[PDB]
Design a protein around this ligand. Structure first.
Ligand SMILES: CON(C)S(=O)(=O)c1ccc(Cl)cc1
Lengths: 1725, 260
């Protein structure tokens, strides 16, 4: 709305805060009266009469409450009148509530009833509470009240096993607080600042109920915090569609109905008003308003009034007097005690000879303070915050016994102690406010609370509150305590800061959002209901009835204010708001917006300490501070001694603030109430203001100022300067010692090198040489060392090792210790790199490895520096110089191969009709790259390498090579490895269509099932595989002919040798080379890769002649790539994503407004959020629905096939999304709509970037980091994924170009420029992955001594790269001496580990030999450490119990994620499972898989995530079970081996030993198993043998389902088994016994095993086990696969002659209940 | 008769600390006086980065000094590239500096040659100080590694808003006069302008120097002068020096404020 106006917010502010009196008149209850006295007037208000019970209202006994909530009322009989009117609304409904009741009427028990209702929603059937299901926020206004509430709610709810807790200070090390707690009690400000950050996995998604106690705080200057909380909550409701219950507890004051509107309370359902007659004890009130203006005699008048009033109660009533200071408490107690002595009246307080006088004299002589003993035997007492817990408890326990007569105290006791008194006197209502810089009136909440303490609840028939103030304030207090001081909104001043908080969160992205947000404020309600009070004329309102224009004007004014101070970029025409890092910092650190404007103005990298302290002193938080005349002399006494000089004159408030901070760090005590208060106020804010400065300058890279400001943060926290002995930070050390030490003036560091004796001597007091020693090694201290690893001549990879060098002690270190790692340049001037490092207690003894990239240049600089500095410990830092004097750079990479301008090659160049049938429909010509490599690939057998960008058609080049194979050899075998399973599947579709459909060869895709894969390798001409499925196969190459008979070996995407799974790929390639050299009949190798800088190393490794290596660089991509990299300055990820939201849209319109667009986003949740955001932007834009290119109804036959409604709406407006949790058919539909042109934009998650069958004109990569939940940290996208995402912007048949925009954190920008515009250098990491391959090659007899190992290493790419880039592999030279020693060390270490694990034997320290464990590890492709654990854990007595436990504990399964949101879902799961596990920790992947496996065996189906996880657990379970079978069998153990053999079946079919065989049949349920087990049928043959009609009669099943049953019944094994002991009449002891068994299948192998609940297709496996059951003894075993007919021979040794009766066992690995048993006997002689 | 007034201290080091915070502006205005008719001996190339850091850690009243270490560009033995500045425990006045007797010793400097020293000066001067001639000569007489034809004195003079550098070497006669000189005043008997000559010096941006600082302390002792001894011993470390008024140079200010 364009005709806007800029307002003066300040002119609209209620200057008087909670003291603003909106009401013009005050009517007092009947019987009030006004006494005139000398210079002061008195107003008396009598105690009110309660109405007994009103109209038909009775007191509910706890017995009639719901039973689950009774426990929370243990120890009570019936609720009071308030709780009884409220229990239905509170316990029986979810209605939002507002309860207005006089203070102390019972409101917090009503809050307990709401809490209990919430708690009831999560009692599972075992009676405990899913305490991970919800959270409850209790917002209380004062800290003392918070602490008391935590205590009392904890006690009331302890019967429910619920944690109630407060949130304390440091939260970046202590967010586990929130996870551990169900009821969070905090202040408004704390919850504001916490939810201001947000963050993804914040536990604020569990919030179900928010309780806003003392909500009349809205009238206070603090009230806008409650308004921000409620508006934010209601907005989060709107966005996330979760509902959260809001409960307000208020005093009884006008505008309560507006407050109800503001909390979304239905006035007919949730609003309850109980007037002041419902006070627990009726209150007689006296107000004393003094008229005497002159201070000196007004003071005496005050003390006279209080003396007289206290005399009215001496000996009848205790009197609680309330004073404004910790000092005036004692001063006033003594003032009236002394005026009492002067007139001889103390005898009234303690009647003589009383037990009371003796008790008080004894407790004052035993326990002692200064004034507390100076007062306690008189009946007096004081109480405040500078008092010991035990002395406060003493005052409290003595007062409770009705022993103290006059107790003088502060508001803290009103708020945090439950201590009433018959008479209360509030002595004066003035208090010093430093924030306001002057004396002001007490706030309303304080007054209400203190006078609420009047009258003890059970001992007094009436209370007597006496308020003493200035006469001009009488109408105010009379209004406050008599239901007539209206609750107004104070938020108009805080509007800029609150608005910026919502912009930073992304809840408000433009002015229309801000208007809707402001319509949730309490300010908005009060504006509608009383516009004149808020500056709106009644005629302005009638012309703007919703105050749309007025809210637009306020938001405009605030947005202009924030934009002028650079917190926000405000586009006025569009109303759009752009966040900034400065804005974020203002919000996250609770800094007002003018202050960060100052910080942005004055902060400079050259700033000195002097200027830093001055910048601090200029904060707007101190704008009301002034330099008073009475302060000036003491301020000058300090300003001439300050260690940091102050340039400003003493007349300037900034100089005073500077000096107060410096005095505070030096722990000076000042004279002057004002100065002490002002210092407290300055320094309580200094912490977070200085932490904001530190964040600004750290993220700017300013090394020196970062150091200075982090130091200042710590000097404020710890109250000392660097110069002081850091040992002061051990509170428990005596100060005289540390003073001795730091006076001795010697470096603290040297103390580490001495012992208790020598330090005891150096300080001249050896009495505690040991003690100092302790603390010296308790001080945090890290040792640093570095491995430099050159990536190129200008990018350096650093691996920092951090070794802790101190003793941990949780009394001083807590549970973690935080540090900053800072990487600074030559001059200690720029922070080239920085990160947070957290040393957790559980890891306090381990080396920590950190790795990162820093730029470098030529000529190399002298050195960099790595500092590691404590985040909170002063003088606690290690600096490691990183010298470059001995750094070996790799050579500049060679130029690319020139792209030849050749005649584009026709398809007809294939010179083959059938061959040309594969491409001639698709295009007329091959691109320039294929045209250049064709002659070498198609007309030669040379090994070939093709390096080029993704999207250059390298796969067609490998197709050239395959076709040459097919012409050479009518039955040639080709093996094609790609590194990703999704790529393998795409290639399998396309190549199945090309070579089997068209050319009628056989194309096969390896599954991972070794017998299946061997038959595929036997029958297929094209074998497509991922690396590990080829590793397990090609290990056994000496025994497997189909492995060596390969004509052609093609490896795709070979640059991934350099990435996380590179080692296995490097190994299999090296092996293909070695095999080719052994069998002396060459195997041609074709390598395809992204553009590589060290291409020639790869080609030479794979034996590619230089003329046969095509090393192209990114500029040759056939569709030109316009790459744009925009950097983003915000270091906080959720805010950085926010700042990218709209640039995504603008990028679409600038680079591809008509043509298809993919947007890659970092997470599943982000795909949906960004699709919606793009949609919102184009809606608020002119072009709405501009991304839909078919009609709204051609789409709906597609659409109804989906389930996600959001995906439906977005697709309707032209935007799809893809993520992993979508059903495969949903993803297929979105892909088909995208590639057809219908929808223009698809938003896909990072992880799907390899299995996407769509391409686009524009790819946007929105941020380049993802959150990893295992390590709780953000990880960078591997460069390989980024290359793959960029490759998607390539449409050769449709586009003249491809465009890609990469949005990244700015500090990554230059890295991407170096590694995208230039080719990629890759390295081996096989040296880090040696053991399992060494073990395979010792099993295979390729390696038989250490020399063989060194030699075999020379075939690898690692060996080639050790010469080109020695430092990367930790060599210091490239001579043959060098790498000979390096390889020998590598070999010795790997073989020693294997020999220690008992996988290999080593004899004469030279000869290695495979052991049985290693043979098992190599056969089933299992990690050697896993098989070692297995050798440990298995015994002669394990069975189905122990086996699940053992196999859960596998290195293959510790990669299983542990996300907090299952920590109860599994807790109850571990309860429904048959095998009761042993001592459960629940942060363990091994236990998690144990329970997921018990889930799968029981057929419990779970979520989509737990299903995704079980589906990959199952792909390794069979190998692991068979490894256990092999271990147990080798040992000699019959029972445990047969148990594991049946566990194979159990895992396959998803049943148990106890469950019935019929559970294997399709469409069978428990009732069918009952009607079967009842009469006639127990097994699957029972069902085959039944009649066809009786089958259906018992089955109760469809006919399609009966055919499903029949398929299984015909694949079910029925084998005739025969056995004979060959020459059983000639058996001698110790001689050979050969038994022959013969297996004949009745109908052969139709096909694989029917196991719908097991992912991979299996084939039936069988074991033949000869044993003796008594002995628990297995004497022979063989493994066979059966194809109709098969014979097996088992040879074993005979023992001496006796009684020997053996059993023959025939056991399956797939089906249950086919296991046959034949006992037999042989006469040994 | 008379009135009554009280004295509030006005300590000079505070005005100096305020002033030293602004030293960084001078680093954008560094001048090398090139008025030598012909160069005598070699050409010295000072890297800008260490020069500017050296300026920022100094004081406008109290001289500081650093030792120069360097090498020759491979094919040009007549160029000396200054590669390192070593700061050692020192104190100073406006006319001279007090260094320990012991020259820097460290493995990192063992492949470098000592090229003399650099020091700041409050005011420009047409002539080389006789304090400087005496200091250079007494160093040469205690330490034979300092060749008179190869070691220099770079003065960094504080000219308004800027810095002017000039580089000198001693002469045989200058060495012989300075080693026997014991008059430390502004005009000692025997002092001549024939005792020194101006060597050519250039400021370069193409390479970087580094710093070495003491191992167990810092280098500034102008607030702890008692703890400074001509015979004192020190090791070094590869790190950058702290500014003149950094807290760990004046710990007594911080401890004695906290007293009262
Ligand atoms: C201000 O923000 N809160 C008070 S909150 O606890 O985080 C929250 C969370 C979810 C929903 Cl639906 C509403 C509110």
């Amino acid at each position: 709305l364009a005709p806007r106006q800029v307002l003066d917010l300040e002119d609209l502010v209620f200057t008087q805060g909670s003291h603003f009196m909106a009401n013009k008149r005050c009517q007092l209850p009947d019987g009030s009266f006004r006494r005139q006295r000398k210079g002061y007037e008195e107003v008396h208000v009598p105690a009110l009469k309660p109405k007994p019970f009103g109209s038909e209202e009775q007191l509910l006994p706890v017995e009639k409450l719901p039973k689950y909530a009774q426990a929370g009322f243990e120890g009570f009989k019936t609720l009071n009148r308030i709780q009884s009117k409220l229990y239905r609304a509170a316990l029986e409904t979810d209605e939002n509530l507002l309860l207005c009741a006089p203070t102390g009427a019972g409101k917090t028990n009503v809050a307990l009833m709401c809490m209990l209702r919430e708690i009831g929603k999560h009692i599972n059937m075992d009676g405990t509470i899913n305490v991970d299901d919800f959270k409850i926020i209790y917002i209380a206004p004062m800290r003392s009240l918070v602490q008391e509430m935590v205590g009392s709610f904890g006690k009331r709810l302890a019967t429910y096993g619920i944690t109630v807790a407060e949130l304390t200070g440091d939260h970046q090390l202590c967010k586990e607080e929130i996870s551990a707690t169900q009821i969070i009690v905090c202040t408004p400000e704390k919850w504001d600042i916490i939810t201001r950050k947000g963050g993804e996995r914040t536990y604020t998604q569990l919030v179900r109920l928010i309780i806003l106690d003392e909500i009349h705080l809205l009238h206070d200057d603090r009230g806008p915090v409650l308004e921000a909380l409620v508006a934010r909550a209601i907005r989060n409701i709107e966005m996330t569609q979760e509902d959260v219950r809001l409960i307000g507890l208020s005093a009884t004051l006008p505008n309560y109905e507006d407050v109800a509107t503001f909390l979304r309370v239905d006035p007919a359902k949730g609003l309850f008003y109980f007037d002041n007659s419902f006070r627990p004890v009726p209150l007689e009130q006296t107000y004393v308003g003094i008229t005497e203006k002159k201070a000196i005699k007004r003071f005496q008048i005050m003390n006279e009034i209080v003396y007289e009033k206290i005399m009215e109660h001496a000996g009848k009533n205790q009197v609680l007097v309330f004073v404004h200071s910790r000092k005036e408490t004692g001063k006033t107690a003594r003032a009236i005690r002394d005026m009492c002595l002067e007139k001889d009246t103390l005898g009234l307080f303690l009647r003589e000879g009383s037990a009371s006088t003796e008790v008080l004299r004894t407790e004052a002589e035993q326990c002692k303070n200064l004034e507390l003993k100076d007062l306690l035997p008189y009946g007096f007492a004081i109480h405040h915050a500078g008092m010991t817990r035990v002395d406060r408890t003493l005052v409290e326990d003595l007062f409770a016994d009705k022993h103290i007569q006059v107790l003088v105290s502060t508001a803290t006791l009103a708020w945090g102690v439950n201590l009433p008194a018959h008479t209360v006197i509030i002595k004066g209502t003035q208090v010093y406010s430093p924030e306001k810089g002057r004396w002001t009136e007490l706030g309303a909440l304080d007054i209400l609370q203190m006078l609420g303490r009047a009258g003890r609840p059970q001992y007094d028939t009436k209370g007597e509150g006496i308020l003493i103030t200035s006469h001009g304030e009488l109408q105010y207090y009379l209004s406050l305590l008599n239901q007539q001081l209206p609750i107004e909104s104070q938020m108009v001043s805080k509007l800029p800061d609150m608005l910026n908080a919502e912009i930073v969160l992304g809840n408000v992205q433009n002015a229309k959002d801000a208007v809707n947000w402001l319509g949730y404020a309490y300010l908005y309600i009060r504006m509608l209901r009383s516009p004149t009070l808020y500056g709106i004329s009644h005629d302005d309102l009638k012309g703007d009835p919703l105050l749309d224009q007025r809210r637009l004007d306020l938001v405009h004014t605030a947005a202009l204010m924030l934009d002028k101070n650079n917190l926000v970029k405000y586009d006025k025409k569009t109303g759009n708001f752009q966040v900034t890092e400065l804005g974020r910092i203002a919000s996250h650190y609770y800094i007002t917006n003018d202050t960060v404007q100052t910080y942005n103005q004055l902060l400079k990298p050259t700033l000195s300490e002097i200027e830093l302290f001055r910048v601090f002193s200029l904060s707007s938080e101190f704008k009301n501070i002034t330099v008073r005349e009475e302060e000036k002399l003491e301020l000058q006494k300090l300003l001439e001694r300050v260690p940091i000089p102050v340039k400003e004159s003493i007349e300037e408030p900034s100089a005073k603030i500077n000096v107060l901070l410096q005095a505070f760090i030096s722990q000076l005590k000042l004279e002057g109430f004002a100065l002490m208060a002002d210092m407290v106020y300055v320094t309580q804010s200094a912490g977070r203001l200085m932490r904001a400065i530190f964040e600004i300058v750290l993220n700017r890279g300013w090394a020196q100022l970062t150091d200075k400001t982090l130091n200042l943060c710590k000097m404020i926290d710890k109250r000392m300067w660097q110069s002081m002995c850091p040992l002061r930070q051990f509170r428990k050390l005596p100060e005289e010692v540390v003073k001795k030490i730091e006076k001795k003036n010697f470096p603290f560091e040297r103390l580490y090198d001495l012992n208790h004796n020598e330090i005891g001597e150096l300080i001249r007091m050896p009495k505690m040489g040991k003690t100092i020693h302790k603390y010296v090694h308790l001080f945090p201290k890290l040792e640093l060392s570095v491995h430099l690893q050159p990536i190129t001549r200008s990018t350096l990879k650093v691996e920092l090792t951090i070794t802790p060098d101190f003793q941990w002690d949780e009394k001083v270190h807590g549970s973690s210790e935080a540090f900053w790692i800072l990487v600074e340049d030559v001059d200690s001037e720029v922070i080239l790199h920085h990160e947070y490092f957290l040393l957790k207690a559980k890891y306090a003894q381990d080396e920590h490895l950190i790795t990162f990239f820093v730029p470098v240049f030529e000529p190399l600089p002298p050195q960099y520096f790595i500092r590691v500095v404590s985040d909170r410990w002063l003088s606690c830092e290690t600096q490691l110089p990183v010298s470059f004097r001995h750094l070996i750079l790799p050579e500049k990479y060679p130029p690319p191969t020139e792209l030849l301008d050749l005649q584009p090659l026709p398809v007809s160049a294939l010179r083959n009709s059938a061959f040309e049938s594969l491409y001639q429909d698709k295009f007329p010509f091959f691109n320039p790259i294929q045209t250049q490599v064709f002659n070498t690939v198609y007309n030669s057998d040379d090994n070939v390498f093709v390096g080029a960008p993704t999207g250059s058609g390298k796969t067609i080049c490998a197709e050239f090579a395959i076709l040459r194979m097919l012409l050479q050899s009518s039955e040639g075998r080709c093996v094609y490895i790609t590194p990703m399973e999704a790529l393998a599947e795409q290639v399998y579709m396309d190549w199945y269509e090309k070579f089997q459909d068209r050319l009628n060869k056989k194309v096969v895709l390896l599954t991972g099932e070794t017998s299946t894969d061997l038959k595929l390798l036997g029958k297929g001409n094209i074998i497509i595989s991922t690396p590990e499925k080829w590793d397990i196969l090609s290990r056994r190459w000496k025994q497997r002919k189909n492995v060596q008979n390969i004509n052609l070996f093609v490896v795709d995407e070979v640059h991934l040798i350099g990435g996380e799974n590179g080692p296995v790929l490097e190994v299999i390639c090296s092996r293909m080379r070695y095999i080719s050299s052994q069998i002396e009949r060459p195997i041609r190798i074709v390598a395809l890769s992204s553009s590589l800088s060290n291409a020639k190393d790869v080609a030479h490794w794979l034996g590619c002649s230089a003329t046969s290596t095509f090393n192209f660089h990114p500029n040759v991509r056939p569709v030109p790539l316009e790459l744009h990299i925009q950097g983003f300055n915000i270091s906080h990820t959720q805010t950085r994503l926010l700042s990218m939201a709209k640039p995504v849209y603008h990028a679409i319109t600038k680079h591809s407004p008509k043509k298809p667009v993919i947007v890659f986003v970092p997470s599943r949740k982000q795909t949906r959020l960004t699709a919606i955001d793009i949609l919102t932007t184009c809606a608020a834009d002119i072009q709405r629905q501009r991304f839909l290119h078919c009609t709204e109804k051609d789409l709906i036959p597609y659409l109804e096939k989906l389930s996600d409604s959001t995906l439906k709406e977005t697709l309707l407006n032209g935007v799809g999304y893809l993520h992993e949790g979508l059903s495969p058919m949903e993803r297929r539909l979105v892909e088909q709509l995208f590639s057809s042109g219908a929808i223009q934009v698809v938003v896909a998650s990072r992880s799907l970037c390899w299995g996407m069958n769509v391409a686009a004109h524009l790819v946007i990569i929105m941020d380049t980091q993802y959150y990893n939940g295992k390590i709780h940290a953000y990880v960078d996208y591997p460069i390989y994924d980024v290359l793959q995402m960029v490759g998607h912007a390539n449409r050769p048949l449709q586009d003249d170009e491809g465009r890609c925009v990469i949005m990244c954190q700015g500090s990554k920008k230059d890295f991407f420029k170096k590694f995208l515009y230039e080719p990629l250098p890759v390295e081996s990491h096989l040296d880090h992955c040696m053991h399992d391959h060494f073990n395979a090659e010792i099993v295979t007899k390729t390696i038989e001594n250490k020399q063989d190992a060194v030699d075999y290493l020379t075939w690898t790419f690692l060996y080639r790269r050790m010469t080109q880039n020695p430092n990367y592999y930790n060599l210091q030279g490239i001579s043959h001496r060098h790498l000979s020693d390096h390889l020998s060390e590598l070999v010795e270490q790997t073989l020693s580990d294997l020999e220690q694990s008992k996988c290999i034997s080593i004899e004469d320290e030279m000869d290695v030999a495979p052991l049985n464990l290693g043979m098992i590890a190599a056969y089933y492709y299992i990690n050697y450490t896993t098989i070692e654990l297995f050798s440990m854990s298995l015994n002669a007595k394990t069975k189905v119990r122990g086996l699940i436990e053992i196999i859960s504990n596998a290195a293959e399964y510790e990669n299983i994620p542990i996300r907090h949101h299952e920590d109860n879902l599994l807790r109850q799961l571990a309860q429904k499972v048959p095998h009761k596990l042993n001592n459960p920790k629940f942060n363990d992947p091994h236990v998690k898989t144990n329970l997921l496996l018990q889930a799968h065996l029981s057929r419990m189906q779970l979520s989509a995530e737990l299903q995704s996880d079980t589906e990959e657990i199952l792909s390794k379970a069979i190998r692991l079970i068979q490894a256990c079978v092999d271990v147990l069998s080798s040992n000699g153990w019959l029972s445990p081996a047969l148990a594991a053999m049946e566990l194979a079946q159990m895992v396959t079919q998803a049943m148990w030993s106890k469950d019935s065989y019929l559970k294997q049949l399709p469409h069978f349920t428990s009732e069918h198993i009952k009607r079967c087990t009842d009469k006639g049928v127990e097994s699957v043959f029972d069902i085959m043998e039944m009649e066809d009609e009786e089958r259906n009669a018992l089955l109760q099943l469809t006919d399609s389902q009966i055919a499903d049953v029949a398929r299984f019944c015909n694949r079910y094994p029925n084998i005739e088994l025969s056995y004979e002991v060959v020459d059983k009449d000639s058996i001698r002891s110790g001689g050979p016994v050969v038994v022959l068994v013969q297996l004949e299948r009745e109908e052969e192998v139709t096909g694989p095993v029917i196991a719908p609940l097991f992912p991979q297709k299996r084939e039936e496996g069988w074991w033949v086990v000869i044993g003796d059951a008594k002995s628990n003894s297995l004497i022979s075993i063989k493994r066979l696969t059966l194809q109709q007919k098969a014979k097996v021979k088992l040879d074993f040794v005979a023992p001496a002659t006796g009684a020997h009766n053996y059993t023959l066992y025939f056991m399956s690995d797939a089906y249950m209940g086919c296991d046959q048993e034949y006992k037999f006997s042989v006469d040994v002689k | 008769g008379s009135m009554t007034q009280t004295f509030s201290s006005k300590t000079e080091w505070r005005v100096r600390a305020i002033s030293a915070a602004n030293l960084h502006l001078r680093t954008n205005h560094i001048y090398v006086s090139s008025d030598d008719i012909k160069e005598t001996g070699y050409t010295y190339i000072l890297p800008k980065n260490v020069l500017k850091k050296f300026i920022c850690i100094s004081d406008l009243r109290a001289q500081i000094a650093g030792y120069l270490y360097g090498v020759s560009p491979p094919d040009n033995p007549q160029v000396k590239e200054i590669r390192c500045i070593v700061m050692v425990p020192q104190w100073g006045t406006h006319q001279t500096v007090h260094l320990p007797g012991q020259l820097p010793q460290h493995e990192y400097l063992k492949e470098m040659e000592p090229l003399g020293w650099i020091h700041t000066q409050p005011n420009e001067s047409p002539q080389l100080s006789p304090q400087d001639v005496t200091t250079h000569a007494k160093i040469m007489a205690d330490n034979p590694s300092w060749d008179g034809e190869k070691t220099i004195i770079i003065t960094c003079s504080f000219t308004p808003g800027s810095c002017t550098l000039t580089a000198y070497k001693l002469t045989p006669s200058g060495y012989e006069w300075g080693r026997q000189n014991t008059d430390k005043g502004n005009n000692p008997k025997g002092y001549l302008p024939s005792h020194y000559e101006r060597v050519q010096m250039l400021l370069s941006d193409r390479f970087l120097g580094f710093f070495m600082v003491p191992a167990q302390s810092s280098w500034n002792y102008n607030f702890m002068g008692v703890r400074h001894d001509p015979n004192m011993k020190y090791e070094l470390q590869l790190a950058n020096p702290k500014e003149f008024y950094h807290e760990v140079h004046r710990p007594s200010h911080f401890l004695n404020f906290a007293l009262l």
